[PDB]
Amino acid sequence: FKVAHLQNSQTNSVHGIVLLQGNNGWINILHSTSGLWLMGCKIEGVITDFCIDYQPISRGKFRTILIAVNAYGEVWEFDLNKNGHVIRRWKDQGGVGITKIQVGGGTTTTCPALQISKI
Amino acid sequence: AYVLTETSAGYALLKASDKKIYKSSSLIQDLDSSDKVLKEFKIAAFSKFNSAANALEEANSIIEGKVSSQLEKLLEEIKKDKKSTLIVSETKLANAINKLGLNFNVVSDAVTLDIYRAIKEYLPELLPGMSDNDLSKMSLGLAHSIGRHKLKF
Amino acid sequence: KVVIEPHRHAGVYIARGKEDLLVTKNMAPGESVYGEKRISVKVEYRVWNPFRSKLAAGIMGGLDELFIAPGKKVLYLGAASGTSVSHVSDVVGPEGVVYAVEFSHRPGRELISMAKKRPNIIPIIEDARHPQKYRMLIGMVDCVFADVAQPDQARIIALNSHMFLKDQGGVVISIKANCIDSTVDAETVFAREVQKLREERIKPLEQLTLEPYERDHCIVVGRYMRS
Amino acid sequence: LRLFSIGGSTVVTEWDLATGLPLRNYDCNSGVIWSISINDSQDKLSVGCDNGTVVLIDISGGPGVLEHDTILMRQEARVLTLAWKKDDFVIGGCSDGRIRIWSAQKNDENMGRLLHTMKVDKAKKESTLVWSVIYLPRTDQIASGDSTGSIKFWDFQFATLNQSFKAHDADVLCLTTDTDNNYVFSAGVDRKIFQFSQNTNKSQKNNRWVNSSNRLLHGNDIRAICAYQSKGADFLVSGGVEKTLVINSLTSFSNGNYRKMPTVEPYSKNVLVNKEQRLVVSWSESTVKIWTMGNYKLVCKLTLKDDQNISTCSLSPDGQVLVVGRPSTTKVFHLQPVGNKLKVTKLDNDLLLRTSTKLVKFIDNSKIVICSCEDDVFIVDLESEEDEKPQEVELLEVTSTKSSIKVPYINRINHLEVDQNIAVISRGCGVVDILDL
Amino acid sequence: IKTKKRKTLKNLRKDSVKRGKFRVQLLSTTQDSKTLPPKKESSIIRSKDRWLNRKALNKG
Amino acid sequence: PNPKAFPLADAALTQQILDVVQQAANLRQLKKGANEATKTLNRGISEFIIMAADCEPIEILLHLPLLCEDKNVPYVFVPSRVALGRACGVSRPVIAASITTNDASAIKTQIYAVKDKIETLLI
């Protein structure tokens, strides 16, 4: 599992989400306080890893992207603000037996932001 | 009507005595005998290939289905009768003949298969001046030329 | 010394002696089109290989009437490398004509190279789905042999047999069930192909599975009925 | 109009709608056919077969012409269901539990290539079979039902899953959708029809489907569902193992009324009654059972060899002659009362054996009138001095029209009645003609 | 009796007769394939009915 | 991919092929390189041949389908030579790999399943 920040954009309020890897390419995304099932994103093939990317939209607004990779090398990018629909899909060059995926150089799940402007 | 037969030796236009022969369904019964086929069809024109290179050019012309210049001249040697029926073995060759300037009409159908079977069966008898061995040698040379052109070879 | 026994079908012989083989007379003496054996008894015979090719796999299985005689003209479809085509040419002799059709260029080069020395073979490098393209080269033929490994073998034989084959001529087809459904017993596929030929117009006379030479292969022999 | 059927074999049958006979039996080149579909331009039939292959058939030549075009990239699992996107893509649900998209675009290197594969959520106890896929044009999506009961909506472009529902408790055999792709309907072994909706503007903007409703209207399973919409028509026709046809509304599925048609509507009859001998004659497929009524007894039961079902039967006024008419052949029996039962003998009439029978009636104990499947009307004297030619009856010619071109069977004789020398024929188009025999 | 009649009917309806190594098969009449669609492949489509009537679906 | 590359497999078959290639690499049942694949074809000890469709020029690979048609051995094309090399377990790109023959091999069932799936393409 991983923990990330989600802006709901109905009230522009930010709450934490818990993303759990499951079987059949599933990732289940839950509210971190309620525990309610917010959404779910499915990739094809045996899912091996996922990570969270953030993209600032405006002043005080940002979007959360789920980047999920299977064992083949196919990588899906979902927009968690737009009901978890797929932004894009691409392929890892070379790409076989992938175990890990990780973004870096910005706000990650390892190093989070202390405020929305720091994203 | 008229039928068009492409041989190894050269193009031929055979004048079928009945214009309704193409629409007629008794072709299999009528065309069984070699003498009957020779009586039914007369040689309107037999335009041979003078050169082996010209023969190969006409051969891949028929292969691609486009009408060659020599075939265009043979078709331009048309009868005075308007809307005469031409029978073409290949459908896209018939389409090209219709697209070209032609007062005569063109028909390609599965009924015509028995007719083309009769001419291909009794071709050396129908075509004058050509022996069976000569036609076979011409077919051999044309086949080797076509194969050598289609391959690099 | 060895003895030459005349096989039931014309132009086919059996060597008899210390070792027994199937042989055909050689059109070009002193030459072998591929690595087959030659026996000189004078007259020279080339040795058929029934494991290599499927026509006299059917002969060794005991086909009744082959439709291939020294007088006849034969249309060979699926003539890869000309290996069986050379023996068909040997059977039909100098008088008969074998029109060998092949699509692929890599066996096409060697088919042309063998037809260079063999006079009665007319090589065609052209796709077999389209009989109208090589209609200049063919007249009428007495028999049609098929060795194509295609799903629509019945359609290809229909198109070629309607257009080139004479009435009461013969159709000899080699069918592999693997290029067809291949998840049922091969007998089912063979029955389907026989029914397809009956639909086309070929009235079948006999069927022969080619064990031990090929697995799930049959030769279906039939007669064309234009009427 | 052309009608094609698959019936559990390797052969697609195209029907002659004028006569009701198989116009052509085209054997597809590989394997037992499970699924059939036609493309958008109606030039190509895609058939999905038992060995995993999908075969394209060019039918653009005309009525009676079918040709093999292409066999797409093979697989191991049975293709249980098929659908088309435009003329460009073929979607197929398979028995391994997954959905496959092949490219059927000519002039492309991807032609016949298996572009995408997507696995549905498998069942833990058993196998998973994707029984139905449909393609939604407006929202570029594939709707799928499987054996677990889950209805899934897939983004076509990325070949991904947008949305999933666990709606049915059993198999989802059939799916359909409306014209504007506002509603998707599913049905199966669960015996309920489920309506999913995108009708609201917010749902259209967000591309989110809502499990709007379900209705329990069938007594047994549901095998087929289909929908039609025009200015005067708005309905959803469904049927299954209950052998009865249920009609709903499309827009008013949840609220509007429904109608269950009778299981048997005897437009063509399978029971006749002979008044003089007090007999009831009923014919099923190859069986003719006769009862006497006075109290009811089964006097005789006829089992016939030919595989074709019996289309019609006719019994003489004295009760001796029974004419059994099939679209293949026609057979005549003489029935003699021997005790309780009747001894049955067969009379050989060459014309009737060679004759296809659509409608048959009797003038008397001797002469019969037959309208054939080729629409010709003639009179047979049955017993005669020799085997003379049957008497042909002249008929007026109905003028051809647009509907006669489109629907072929309307300009054919539908009803035939006779009394004494007068007879009445009526066409399907509504033409009534009197024959003085 | 009934078994003998069934055996006689089966022998009458049989269309393949073996003669040593050879086996003679009847060519079917041309009328049947014209008048009807081909007969269904029994086992393959019976798999579907067995699946629809499987026991995991408590169907009473 | 090149049109001469035939039969090219899809993503799922590529997954299964590369998994079996990895298992054979761990069991030392794998020969790497077009020369060694040629040797196994000649010696008759090859189950099937995997070739990388993005080899440039492809004619280094193109001699192997002729030998496979001669000896009746299944062959298949996977898209990436980098993927094939990483599955073969080496630090270099690999354009041709051969699965060798062993009856006591623990991965025999997987080898024979992927071999049949390849043969369906060659049909």
UniProtKB/Swiss-Prot annotation, chain B:
GO biological process, one term: box C/D sno(s)RNA 3'-end processing
Chain segments annotated as transmembrane: none
Compartments, record wording: Nucleus, Nucleolus
Cellular component aspect of the GO annotation: 90S preribosome; box C/D methylation guide snoRNP complex; nucleolus; nucleoplasm; small-subunit processome
GO molecular function: mRNA binding; snoRNA binding; snRNA binding
Subunit structure: Interacts with SIK1/NOP56 and NOP1. Interacts with the trimethylguanosine synthase TGS1. Component of the ribosomal small subunit (SSU) processome composed of at least 40 protein subunits and snoRNA U3.
Protein's name in the database: Nucleolar protein 58
Organism: Saccharomyces cerevisiae (strain ATCC 204508 / S288c) (Baker's yeast)
Gene assigned in the entry: NOP58
Residue range from the parent sequence: 2 to 154 of 511
Swiss-Prot record, chain D:
Spans of repeat WD: 21-58, 67-103, 119-155, 160-197, 299-334
Localization per record: Nucleus, Nucleolus
Disulphides: none
Domain of life (superkingdom): Eukaryota
Keywords for the protein's UniProt record, in alphabetical order: Nucleus, Repeat, Ribonucleoprotein, Ribosome biogenesis, rRNA processing, Transcription, WD repeat
One term under GO cellular component: 90S preribosome
Location, primary (coarse class): nucleus
GO BP, sorted A to Z: maturation of SSU-rRNA; maturation of SSU-rRNA from tricistronic rRNA transcript (SSU-rRNA, 5.8S rRNA, LSU-rRNA); positive regulation of transcription by RNA polymerase I
Miscellaneous comment in the UniProt entry for this protein: Present with 5440 molecules/cell in log phase SD medium.
Function according to Swiss-Prot or TrEMBL: Involved in nucleolar processing of pre-18S ribosomal RNA. Required for optimal pre-ribosomal RNA transcription by RNA polymerase I together with a subset of U3 proteins required for transcription (t-UTPs).
Quaternary structure and interacting proteins, as annotated: Interacts with snoRNA U3. Interacts with MPP10. Component of the ribosomal small subunit (SSU) processome composed of at least 40 protein subunits and snoRNA U3. In the absence of snoRNA3, forms a complex with other t-UTPs. This complex can associate with pre-18S ribosomal RNAs.
Name of the protein in its database record: U3 small nucleolar RNA-associated protein 4
Species, as recorded: Saccharomyces cerevisiae (strain ATCC 204508 / S288c) (Baker's yeast)
Swiss-Prot record, chain E:
Protein species of origin: Saccharomyces cerevisiae (strain ATCC 204508 / S288c) (Baker's yeast)
Leader sequence residues: none
Protein name: U3 small nucleolar RNA-associated protein 16
Compositionally skewed regions (Basic and acidic residues) per UniProt: 38-52
Region (Disordered), start-end ranges: 28-60
Subcellular location: Nucleus, Nucleolus
Family assignment from sequence similarity: Belongs to the UTP16 family.
Function: Functions as part of the small subunit (SSU) processome, first precursor of the small eukaryotic ribosomal subunit that coordinates the first two steps of ribosome biogenesis in transcription of the primary transcript pre-RNA and pre-18S processing. During the assembly of the SSU processome in the nucleolus, many ribosome biogenesis factors, an RNA chaperone and ribosomal proteins associate with the nascent pre-rRNA and work in concert to generate RNA folding, modifications, rearrangements and cleavage as well as targeted degradation of pre-ribosomal RNA by the RNA exosome.
Misc remark: Present with 2120 molecules/cell in log phase SD medium.
Gene that specifies this protein: BUD21
Binding partners and assembly: Part of the small subunit (SSU) processome composed of at least 40 protein subunits and the RNA chaperone small nucleolar RNA (snoRNA) U3. Interacts with snoRNA U3. Interacts with MPP10.
UniProtKB/Swiss-Prot annotation, chain F:
Gene3D superfamilies for this protein: 3.30.1330.30
Family matches, as InterPro entries: eL8/uL1-like, H/ACA_rnp_Nhp2-like, Ribosomal_eL30-like_sf, Ribosomal_eL8-like_CS, Ribosomal_eL8/eL30/eS12/Gad45, Ribosomal_eL8/Nhp2
Pfam families xref list: Ribosomal_L7Ae
GO function terms (MF aspect): RNA binding; U3 snoRNA binding; U4 snRNA binding
Gene Ontology biological process terms from the UniProt entry: box C/D sno(s)RNA 3'-end processing; maturation of SSU-rRNA; maturation of SSU-rRNA from tricistronic rRNA transcript (SSU-rRNA, 5.8S rRNA, LSU-rRNA); mRNA splicing, via spliceosome; snoRNA guided rRNA 2'-O-methylation; spliceosomal complex assembly
Keywords noted in UniProt: mRNA processing, mRNA splicing, Nucleus, Ribonucleoprotein, Ribosome biogenesis, RNA-binding, rRNA processing, Spliceosome
Origin: domain of life: Eukaryota
Lipoprotein as UniProt keyword: no
Cellular compartments per GO CC: box C/D methylation guide snoRNP complex; nucleolus; nucleoplasm; nucleus; precatalytic spliceosome; small-subunit processome; spliceosomal complex; U4 snRNP
Presence of keyword Nucleus: yes
Compartments where found: Nucleus, Nucleolus
Quaternary structure and interacting proteins, as annotated: Binds to the C'/D and B/C motifs in U3 snoRNA. Component of the U4/U6-U5 tri-snRNP complex composed of the U4, U6 and U5 snRNAs and at least PRP3, PRP4, PRP6, PRP8, PRP18, PRP31, PRP38, SNU13, SNU23, SNU66, SNU114, SPP381, SMB1, SMD1, SMD2, SMD3, SMX2, SMX3, LSM2, LSM3, LSM4, LSM5, LSM6, LSM7, LSM8, BRR2 and DIB1. Binds to the 5'-stem-loop of U4 snRNA. Component of the ribosomal small subunit (SSU) processome composed of at least 40 protein subunits and snoRNA U3.
Gene that encodes the chain: SNU13
